[PDB]
């Protein structure tokens, strides 16, 4: 229920991944179609799309006869470009990654954790290991420092270059050195677990894995305000107007407030989103 971030407890099957939602939608009894966002953005017909063999899905989708649409597995957003699909009266709900239009019919869902089962990707297999996240979350949370910073600036520099430039040299920041390996993943999670805060700026897409990775480890992610994030304001996320003038005093106060407040942490659990889709069946 409504509870404190510190009180969060996870089971092995709780973690949100887009594969779990995609798999959920394969059972057509639940009356929901999952399409990779690319096939919406680059549609060759206004109201007809297909996964074109993505996840071995060759079905042609007729959106005029689709009651619930679900899009993800893409850093692409849902924006004004898709307004003609959104205005279809037969569509009761559009569940999407990267909601970027202020329309009440479009419902954000968390990017969550990397899809471990991405076929020939060793990187997806390593970072997608939710067991390792679960294991670390059950160890004693021993705070080593205020904020964890482990950021590849390339993914979206206008924000990420400022974070590295402004805060790399702060005593209250620990710089993380990402090693893409089974040992490296464990070390990364342990580091992040031992901080009150993690920097979770947007990347190529608005939503990032770091945001969700942080919340499962009961570490507070820091994220720039965006319409894409506006339905997650009942999660203990530190939303910032910009990246300038973060201090030890500012973060210590935000820590005391966020940890004192009660949050809808059920939204971190895949079951929430299964039931939310079933609600529009
Ligand atoms: Ca301000
Ligand atoms: Ca500021
Ligand atoms: Mg649980
Ligand atoms: Mg899981
Ligand atoms: Mg992109
Ligand atoms: Mg509009
Ligand atoms: Mg590290
Ligand atoms: Mg800024």
Residue numbers in the entry: -1 to 279
Which text from the study accompanies this structure?
Protein A075L is a β‐xylosyltransferase that participates in producing the core of the N‐glycans found in VP54, the major viral capsid protein of Paramecium bursaria chlorella virus‐1 (PBCV‐1). The protein structure shows a typical GT‐B folding, with two Rossmann‐like fold domains, in which the acceptor substrate binds to the N‐terminal region, and the nucleotide‐sugar donor binds to the C‐terminal region. We propose that the catalytic mechanism follows a direct displacement SN2‐like reaction, where Asp73 serves as a catalytic base that deprotonates the incoming nucleophile of the acceptor, facilitating direct displacement of the UDP with the inversion of the anomeric configuration of the acceptor without metal ion dependence, while the interactions with side chains of Arg158 and Arg208 stabilize the developing negative charge. In this context, we herein present the structural and biochemical characterization of A075L, a soluble chlorovirus xylosyltransferase easily produced in E. coli and amenable to large‐scale purification.
